[PDB]
């Protein structure tokens, strides 16, 4: 768990060197993008349940997975699916605020593949659900904030696949 | 590796007893079902490649596993998948002829889970492939021969899962 | 076993996509560094035995491991130690030429820890020997070729530890 | 690739790379620019290659599209053009890598067993790659057509 | 079911089944015939139950079928009839099992979270199960209507 600042400090410390001009430039880049990160995080905190339910309405609804035999069939499985998608959106917001995806592979992508493979959860359908969540939130917060959200959404989909 | 006859003899020998009436009745049951077992084995030996390719055409074709990134992607992986399904059908035929699933956990289900878990082979997709193979061969040989094939197909799917 | 080119092609193929601009940039980076890789590989092929014997003269000589009771004591053990260090230098040269450490964990680091733990080989002393080999070859081929050798030497030491 | 093959061939022999193998890697490293140009030529015009090669194939071998053949119908002809697209993609990979270990190591090992299990005539697939080679070497300069036709030649040779 | 609940309740207590629990299982085993008769009554006439209950629901709560209602546009009403069919199926499961652990353990745990994520008023769903209960207990004898209305009662109680 480290943001862009802590990773820059960790690189300069593992070097043992002081903060040179490249580290200063990286921190200036983060300190310019931080206000946009803050406003996108507020806008995403506004519409958590709406983004999640629009992602299910785009991908998972009216397909086979909500029908009998699907892994999203029962009300318990539906509630756990909404819970999993809320987790993905919340941690993508955290990784957007930090500017570093270390929290994603520390706390989402750690044992997620083995959990989903033990439960029988389809990984492709949940990857499509995360992609639709990314599409909806990029329609919500704009072009560049949607892109800096979608880089961590693509990180979650890549670590899941 | 033992059929119904050898397992009955092994039970009566581990007892140390002679063959009483219950063993005689079990062997009479096997000697009544044996002709149906023979005819179903001939009918399955007729259509090995057709049953295998219809099982892939039902389950695994046009899904994500034959697309890039899937474990059935390359031609080497496709050929090894056809080889694995031919193994499952051949050993299910052997266990149908013997009337005892001892050959299945002796020679298929022995290190199969650990092999598939080390390779990265999806176990649920191959369980669905074996289930479609069972459905196709039960459509081929009829109701009761399909049932006595499906009990060993379900044995393979249960030991794989 | 795959170089930078084969890993880029494998990523673009598992995607199923064509080679986009990021893959072109990665291959341009490898095609710029390849001449330096070639010259460093020739310079390392020049002085195999000298680098190995200077690594033993730096770390393992005149310590307890060449004395009685050490695991490098006998002439058989000394010859096997020189053989193991020649293996580490040769495979580090191969991984430097490929630009990918897949050969190291495919063909060196596969059962090496369990072999060394079964034989009684000290892993810390051989890690120090590989580190001195890295220091000597980085003194031999220069700064940046020594760094791109030392990344695979550190890969071998990390997989061994 | 070339570097993988040289590294492995020196690796079994317990030796370093010989200097002849090293200038082999050096010459491949210098010719990578022309390899990337051939790859862009093959990549950018894949639509016309697949379309014209499918047209010339079904003109040449009409029985596989006639009722009774494998590629009969809409989706079967689409899957046939998809298999041709797969082989053109592997041709591009083998052009970039400088060797046929991408092509062989992806789509040529169990090709007989796979197309035997699908019910496909493999000679008609060899004719499909032949028409792809004709359209592709009709699209380039002379040495570029020879260098691409080497890998097309390897695919048709590995069919039969 | 009853046997699962008795086994688990003796299982946490590290004891065997008490004789009172055993005659509970015995009485449920004897009443299984009447349970299967109620299940056939509920199963065979599911079309009229779902149709008449949907009619009485949309008569009672017209705003969900009205513009701006969650169930708007033929498929929204029709889609709702599928959810009502799901709940009647769970009612049949709970009638056979002798307890509400099928109904609760399948379709009542996260029902609030699901119907809040869909945008559905849960009181109108409770009215749907109320009309289903009215049509179903209008279809049986007295004790059969009481035994089925117990599980219908549990579903409407677990809604609110």
């Amino acid at each position: 768990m480290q943001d862009a600042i802590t990773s820059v400090i960790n690189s300069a410390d593992v070097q043992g060197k002081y903060l040179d001009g490249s580290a200063m430039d990286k921190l200036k880049a983060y300190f310019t993008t931080g206000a946009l990160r803050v406003r996108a995080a507020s806008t995403i905190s506004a519409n958590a349940a709406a983004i999640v339910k629009e992602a299910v309405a785009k991908s998972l609804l009216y397909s086979d997975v909500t029908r009998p035999g699907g892994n999203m069939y029962t009300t318990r499985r539906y509630a756990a699916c909404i819970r999993d998608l809320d987790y993905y959106l919340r941690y993508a917001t955290y990784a957007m605020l930090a500017g570093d995806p270390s929290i994603l592979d520390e706390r989402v992508l750690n044992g997620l593949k083995e959990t989903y493979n033990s439960l029988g959860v389809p990984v492709g359908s949940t990857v499509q659900a995360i992609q639709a969540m990314k599409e909806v939130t990029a329609g919500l917060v704009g072009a560049d904030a949607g892109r800096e959200m979608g880089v961590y959404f693509d990180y979650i989909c890549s670590g899941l696949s | 590796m033992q059929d119904a006859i050898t397992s009955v003899i092994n039970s009566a020998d581990v007892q140390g007893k002679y063959l009483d009436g219950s063993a005689m009745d079990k062997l009479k049951a096997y000697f009544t079902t044996g002709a149906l077992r023979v005819r179903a084995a001939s009918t399955i030996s007729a259509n090995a490649a057709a049953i295998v390719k219809e099982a892939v055409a039902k389950s695994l074709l046009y899904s994500d596993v034959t697309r890039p990134g899937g474990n059935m992607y390359t031609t080497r992986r496709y050929a090894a998948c056809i080889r694995d399904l031919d193994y499952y059908l051949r050993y299910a035929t052997y266990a149908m002829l013997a009337g005892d699933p001892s050959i299945l956990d002796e020679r298929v289900l022995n290190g199969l889970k650990e092999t598939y878990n080390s390779l990265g082979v999806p176990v649920g997709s191959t369980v669905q492939a074996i289930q479609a193979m069972k459905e196709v061969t039960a459509g081929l040989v009829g109701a009761d021969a399909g049932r006595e094939m499906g009990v060993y197909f379900d044995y393979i799917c249960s030991g794989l899962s | 076993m795959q170089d930078a080119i084969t890993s880029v092609i494998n990523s673009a193929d598992v995607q199923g996509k064509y080679l986009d601009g990021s893959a072109m940039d990665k291959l341009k980076a490898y095609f710029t560094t390849g001449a330096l890789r070639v010259r460093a590989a020739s310079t390392i092929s020049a002085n195999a035995a000298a680098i190995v014997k200077e690594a033993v003269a730096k770390s393992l000589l005149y310590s307890d491991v060449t004395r009685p009771g050490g695991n490098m004591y006998t002439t058989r053990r000394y010859a096997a130690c020189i053989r193991d260090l020649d293996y580490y230098l040769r495979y580090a040269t191969y991984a430097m030429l490929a630009g990918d450490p897949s050969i190291l964990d495919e063909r060196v680091l596969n059962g090496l820890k369990e072999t060394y733990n079964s034989l009684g080989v000290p892993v810390g002393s051989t890690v120090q020997a590989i580190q001195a080999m890295k220091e000597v070859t980085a003194g031999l081929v220069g700064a940046d070729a020594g760094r791109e050798m030392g990344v695979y030497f550190d890969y071998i030491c990390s997989g061994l530890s | 690739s070339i570097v993988t093959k040289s590294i492995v061939n020196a690796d079994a022999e317990a030796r370093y790379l010989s200097p002849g193998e090293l200038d082999r890697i050096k010459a491949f490293v210098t010719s990578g620019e022309s390899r990337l140009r051939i790859a862009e030529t093959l990549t950018g015009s894949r639509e016309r290659i697949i379309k014209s090669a499918g047209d010339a194939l079904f003109q040449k071998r009409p029985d596989v599209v006639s009722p009774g053949g494998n590629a009969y119908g809409e989706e079967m002809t689409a899957t046939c053009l998809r298999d041709m697209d797969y082989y053109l993609r592997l041709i591009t990979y083998g052009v970039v890598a400088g060797d046929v270990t991408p092509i062989e190591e992806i789509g040529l090992v169990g090709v007989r067993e796979m197309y035997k299990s699908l019910g496909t005539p493999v000679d008609a697939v060899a004719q499909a790659v032949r028409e792809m080679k004709a359209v592709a070497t009709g699209m380039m300069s002379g040495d570029d057509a020879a260098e691409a036709g080497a890998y097309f030649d390897y695919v048709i040779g590995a069919m039969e | 079911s009853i046997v699962t609940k008795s086994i688990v309740n003796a299982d946490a207590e590290a004891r065997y089944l008490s004789p009172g629990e055993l005659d509970r299982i015995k009485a449920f085993v004897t009443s299984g015939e009447s349970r299967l008769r109620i299940a056939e009554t509920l199963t065979g006439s599911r079309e009229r139950i779902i149709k008449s209950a949907g009619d009485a629901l949309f008569q009672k709560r017209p705003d969900v079928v009205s513009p701006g209602g969650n169930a708007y546009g033929e498929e929204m009403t029709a889609t709702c009839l599928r959810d009502m069919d799901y709940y009647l199926r769970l009612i049949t499961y709970g009638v056979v099992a002798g307890d509400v652990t099928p109904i609760e353990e399948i379709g009542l745990v996260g029902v609030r979270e699901m119907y809040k994520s869909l945008g559905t008023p849960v009181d109108a769903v409770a009215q749907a199960v109320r009309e289903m209960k009215a049509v179903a207990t209008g279809m049986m004898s007295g004790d059969d209507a009481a035994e089925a209305g117990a599980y219908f009662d549990y579903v409407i109680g677990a809604m609110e």
Partner: peptide
């Protein structure tokens, strides 16, 4: 209006369908 029919999914790279439209135009 929220039609309940199953959501359309764009074809993934390498899909058989991708070459459906050209196969319809071809011989």
């Amino acid at each position: 209006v929220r039609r309940f029919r199953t959501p359309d999914r764009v074809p993934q790279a390498g899909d058989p369908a991708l070459f459906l439209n050209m196969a319809r135009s071809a011989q």
